[PDB]
Structure formats: structure tokens, C-alpha cells
Design an enzyme around this catalytic site. Structure first.
Site, PDB file in Angstrom:
ATOM      1  N   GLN A   9      75.030  50.469  69.077  1.00  0.00           N
ATOM      2  CA  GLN A   9      76.440  50.781  69.059  1.00  0.00           C
ATOM      3  C   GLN A   9      77.196  49.831  69.968  1.00  0.00           C
ATOM      4  OE1 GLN A   9      77.659  53.769  67.279  1.00  0.00           O
ATOM      5  NE2 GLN A   9      79.702  52.874  67.666  1.00  0.00           N
ATOM      6  N   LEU A  87      70.335  53.196  69.232  1.00  0.00           N
ATOM      7  CA  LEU A  87      70.165  53.206  67.765  1.00  0.00           C
ATOM      8  C   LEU A  87      69.084  52.198  67.349  1.00  0.00           C
ATOM      9  CD1 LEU A  87      70.967  51.406  65.056  1.00  0.00           C
ATOM     10  CD2 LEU A  87      70.824  53.921  64.831  1.00  0.00           C
TER      11      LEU A  87
END
Length: 282
Positions: A9, A87
Site C-alpha cells: 500500500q 500486502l
């Protein structure tokens, strides 16, 4: 030796992955099927302006990272190690054969939904202060609801917690010599105690999935060491409310003999961190 580094992110941008969708048309269509919308359109055009909302950012990053990996696998010698940032860890596990493409996509779709629904808190990225100086500042200024979210390089730390504390800490952090203190445009205090409810729910979801032993070693954000099969499920929910130990992960790889660190995915965020880690470690 060589390591691939998968971004997370904040690294996304309109135009990401453009040439990959036509190179992998079956996987692109299968992603669309899992997600319920066109992944090409989200990444290329961002027509609903939602590429910056984590429920959408996370699947976008996962798909671009995955297809980027498959292209490198076709074109270059295999990597010796894998690591991904938050992520990005799911990208790393896919690359390692821990789960297949669609299974990882389902995991990150849920991860994004849960994190996107979280309310409370904010985050600030800090440049120019080491971890101990950051901790000292939190203590000295009575910011009891702020956690260390990311340890990114020896001079780059992200803090996360109560919005008011994140706001008022800019002045003492700059006074201490922070070259930059940036309040992130994010929906909640990720990688902090504010994520504990989302962690519990994500753990329950993950109970329904199995994780195969990695075929290429994957360095965990939680431990900054190689993942072991039996501990992967549990660490994946722990990770969302724990610090991302990125700097230590890269230093561990340097200590194993890795000299080539290649970012796999869109952008040069992790490349920049690597440059700061290398300078300090040599």
C-alpha cells in the site's frame, strides 16, 4: 544471490501493470471473476477514483505483483529469496507456491475489505529519525496511543495510532530533526493496536485455508526471518496489528549473501528503501 521484493500500500499508481494484462489474459479474466470488476480498468483508468482505497488497492497490487513475478519467472533466473511489504507478503507467498493465484486473491480481497472497514486512527511517515529516537519522542510527549507500524530503513519509520496524537507529534518530531513528517492519506491506523478487531476476524477467515511449504524461502514481516509452513496461517493475522520489520528483513538477506535486490511489481518504493539499508549496513 538474488531476492525479489514485492511492494504494498502506497506504491500503487494509475497506469500500473498496463502491459501485463495482455501478456496474461487468462489470469486477468480469472481475477475479474474473483473480484466482480475489471482489474485492467481499475489499474489503467481508475474510473471510480478508488485505486487509493485499500479494499481496492490490495487486489490491484496483488495482481500486478503476481503477473510481474510470472513475467520475471519466464525471463530471468529464479530468485533465492522472496520478501513482500505488508500486502506484498501475499505476493511473496504466491511466488513461493504456498497457495495459487486465485486463492491468494481471495485472501487479499478479504484483507482489503476488513482493513477498509476499520475505523479509527491515522498514520505518519517519518524521515530522518531512527527507531530509538522515535520511541523516545513518543514517550517524552505522552503519546500513549501510538505504535510503530513500519521499520522501513534506518532513517524511515511509520507511526500509527490516535489521530490527535499523530497530528500533534509533527512539531516535536520536526524539532528533533525529522527531515519530513507526513500524515498519510489513509482510512485507519494500520499495523497498530487499532487493528486488533480486524485481526481477530481475519484469523477466523484464515482458519478455512491451508498453506503449503514455501518452495522458495519467504522472509516474514513479523519475525524478519524465513517463514515455516506450520506458522504461516497464524502469522498472517498477527501481521496486520504488528510492526512491519522490513529493514531487519533486508539486513537478514544481506547477511545470507544476497547482493541483488529486485523490486517485483510497480514502482521503486522498496528500491529506495534498499538503497538506505545498504548504505548503513556497509
Amino acid at each position: 544471490m538474488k531476492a525479489y521484493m514485492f511492494p504494498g500500500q502506497g506504491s500503487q499508481a494509475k497506469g500500473m501493470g498496463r502491459a501485463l494484462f495482455d501478456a496474461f489474459p487468462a489470469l486477468t479474466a480469472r481475477a475479474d471473476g474473483v473480484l466482480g470488476y475489471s482489474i485492467r480498468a481499475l489499474c489503467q483508468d481508475d474510473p471510480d477514483q478508488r485505486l487509493s482505497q485499500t479494499q481496492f488497492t490490495q487486489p490491484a497490487l496483488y495482481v500486478v505483483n503476481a503477473l510481474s513475478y510470472l513475467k520475471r519467472r519466464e525471463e530471468e533466473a529464479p530468485p533465492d529469496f522472496l520478501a513482500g511489504h505488508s500486502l506484498g507478503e501475499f505476493s511473496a507467498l504466491f511466488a513461493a507456491g504456498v497457495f495459487d493465484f486465485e486463492t491468494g486473491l481471495a485472501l487479499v480481497k478479504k484483507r482489503g475489505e476488513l482493513m477498509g472497514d476499520a475505523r479509527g486512527g491515522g498514520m505518519a511517515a517519518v524521515i530522518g529519525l531512527d527507531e530509538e529516537r522515535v520511541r523516545e519522542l513518543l514517550d517524552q510527549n505522552g503519546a500513549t496511543a501510538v505504535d510503530i507500524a513500519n521499520l522501513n530503513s534506518p532513517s524511515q519509520v511509520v507511526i500509527s495510532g490516535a489521530k490527535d496524537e499523530i497530528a500533534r507529534l509533527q512539531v516535536p518530531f520536526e524539532a528533533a530533526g525529522a527531515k519530513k513528517y507526513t500524515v498519510l492519506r489513509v482510512s485507519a491506523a494500520f499495523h497498530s493496536r487499532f487493528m486488533r478487531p480486524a485481526m481477530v476476524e481475519f484469523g477466523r477467515f484464515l482458519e478455512g485455508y491451508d498453506f503449503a511449504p514455501p518452495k522458495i524461502p519467504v522472509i516474514s514481516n513479523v519475525t524478519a526471518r524465513p517463514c515455516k509452513a506450520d506458522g504461516i496461517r497464524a502469522a498472517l493475522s498477527e501481521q496486520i496489528a504488528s510492526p512491519v520489520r522490513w529493514c531487519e528483513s533486508i539486513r537478514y538477506l544481506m547477511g545470507r549473501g544476497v547482493e541483488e535486490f529486485v523490486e517485483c511489481g510497480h514502482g521503486i518504493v522498496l528500491t529506495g528503501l534498499y538503497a538506505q539499508i545498504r548504505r548503513d549496513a556497509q
